[PDB]
Amino acid sequence: SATTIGPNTCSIDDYKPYCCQSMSGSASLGCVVGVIGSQCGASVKCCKDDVTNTGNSGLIINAANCVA
């Protein structure tokens, strides 16, 4: 993917635009907060929050807090 990330794509159901760096061998998606202007090459997910702790360098989302 190469979608442009901003507080518009995922911000509806209290969501954040998460750039999940899901690669070869990733049970937990390393979803870094999409910076306005950045592009998501991997799995861009619209997740709520999950927990903004224990995962600052790429939020460790349990993949169960997003619409799609």
In order of start, what are the domains of the chain with their CATH numbers? 1-68 (3.20.120.10)
> What is the rounded CA–CA span in Å between residue 2 and residue 19?
11
Secondary element (H or E) of residue 20? strand 16-20
Helices (H) and strands (E) in the chain, counts: 0, 6
Tokens for 13, please give them: 């159901």
Distance CA 23, CA 32 (A): 14
Beta pairing partners, 39:
4
- Given a contact cutoff of 8 angstroms between Cβ atoms, the answer to whether 56 and 25 are in contact is no
